């Protein structure tokens, strides 16, 4: 059998699983109840291209990306979602269980304040430091005289 005939036999061959089993399919129930879309029906579903043609055609009509948002509260879908706050990313801090961790942080903070984590703390030492600074100034003046001469 020539190579071209082998290729067309490979095209007509239908492989099947050896065990004879088949996978479960997940066609939703509304598919059977769908009516077929045809152009000539006066009772068509209005399509996105029909709305675009009615609102200026392609290149003029501005699509609304937030119209099909599925949210908990329907008036939130046109909100301006915050992104930057004080040099930080809001989406990095978005966490569903944020309140529990913030409560834990507050409990740790009050524990540390109770333990004295943030607690902040001699005339002879001040005098010896001032005298040392005077000595360093005199050394600088001596070095400047030497550099001049």
């Amino acid at each position: 059998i020539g190579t071209r005939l082998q290729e067309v036999m490979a095209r007509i061959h239908v492989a099947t699983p050896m065990d004879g089993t088949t996978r479960e399919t997940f066609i939703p129930e509304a598919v059977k109840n769908l009516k077929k879309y045809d152009k000539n029906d006066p009772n068509r579903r209005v399509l996105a291209r029909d709305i675009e043609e009615a609102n200026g055609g392609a290149g003029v009509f501005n699509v609304d990306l937030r119209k099909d948002w599925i949210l908990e509260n329907p008036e939130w879908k046109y909100d301006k979602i915050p992104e930057i706050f004080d040099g930080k990313n809001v989406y990095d801090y978005i966490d569903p269980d944020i309140d529990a961790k913030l409560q834990a942080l507050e409990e740790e903070e009050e524990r540390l304040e109770k333990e004295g984590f943030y607690d902040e703390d001699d005339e002879e030492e001040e005098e010896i430091l001032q005298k040392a600074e005077y000595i360093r100034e005199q050394h600088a003046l001596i070095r400047n005289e030497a550099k001049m001469r």
């Binding site: 071209r4 005939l5 290729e7 067309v8 036999m9 490979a10 095209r11 007509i12 061959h13 239908v14 492989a15 099947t16 699983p17 050896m18 065990d19 089993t21 088949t22 996978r23 479960e24 399919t25 997940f26 066609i27 939703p28 509304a30 598919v31 769908l34 009516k35 879309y37 579903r45 399509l47 996105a48 291209r49 029909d50 709305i51 675009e52 392609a58 290149g59 009509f61 699509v63 990306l65 937030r66 099909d68 948002w69 599925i70 949210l71 879908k77 979602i81 992104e83 990313n89 989406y91």
Partner: protein, 246 residues
């Protein structure tokens, strides 16, 4: 239920669309015709999301998913991720992944039960696929191509693979997947099946260039329409296929 369509005069439907059993993703274009094809077929049964991935329109070849979850690459922005999450219901798990091969539509092909991947994905990416998609994952090549997602279209009904895939490979892969497979082409002999079409359990959208014989092969293998089955190919369609593709 196989529909010929085009995205801005391009026949590569799988490049611009992702179609599963619970949602459809379409690339945002300058018009609403490509969205309206899917809207006319899927009459609000599953949500259709106009989306952008990494600022591009090749979302079909950059995304992979099934009826349980969606995987997006690492270059997806937070607002695109938020738009996908707000558009899809909570039954679908969305995850952004850190795989080095960011073309997930090229490196992952999956149905609701099993998934084939490029043989060089990371292990962590493999358990992320198996967790979010809820499938079993195999590392496989299709006709010596490692881009299984662009070189195969897969559903729960069946699969269509590269036209130069050998018979032994078809039987082994059909035993691995649990579905019947046919080696066929789209768009007058294009072997990029995954870039050429999108398919779910009850709808396929292929390019406008796809001929009537290969369209009928697609309908038979994916069981689309009344009285469609893979057994028609080697019985009632054998003369047509031999006459066309010899």
């Amino acid at each position: 239920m196989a529909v010929r369509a085009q995205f801005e005069n391009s026949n590569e439907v799988g490049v611009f669309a992702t179609l599963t059993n619970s949602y459809c993703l379409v690339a945002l274009g300058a018009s609403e015709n490509f969205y309206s094809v899917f809207e006319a077929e899927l009459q609000d049964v599953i949500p259709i999301c106009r989306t952008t991935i990494a600022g591009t329109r090749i979302i079909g070849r950059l995304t992979a998913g099934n009826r349980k979850g969606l995987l997006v690459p690492t270059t997806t922005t937070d607002q695109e991720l938020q738009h996908l999450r707000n558009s899809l219901p909570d039954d679908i798990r969305i995850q952004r992944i850190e795989e080095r091969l960011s073309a997930l539509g090229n490196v992952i092909v999956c149905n609701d039960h099993t998934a084939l991947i490029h043989p060089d994905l990371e292990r962590e990416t493999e358990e992320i696929i198996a967790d979010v998609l809820g499938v079993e994952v195999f590392r496989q090549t299709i006709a010596d191509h490692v881009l299984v997602g662009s070189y195969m279209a897969l559903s729960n009904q069946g699969g269509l693979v590269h036209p130069k895939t050998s018979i032994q490979d078809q039987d082994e892969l059909s035993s691995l997947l649990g579905v019947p497979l046919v080696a066929g082409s789209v768009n007058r002999g294009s072997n990029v099946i995954g870039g050429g079409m999108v398919v779910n359990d009850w709808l396929a959208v292929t390019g406008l260039d796809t001929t009537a014989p290969e369209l009928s092969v697609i309908e038979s293998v994916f069981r689309l329409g009344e009285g469609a089955g893979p057994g028609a190919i080697n019985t009632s369609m054998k003369n047509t296929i031999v006459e066309s593709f010899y």
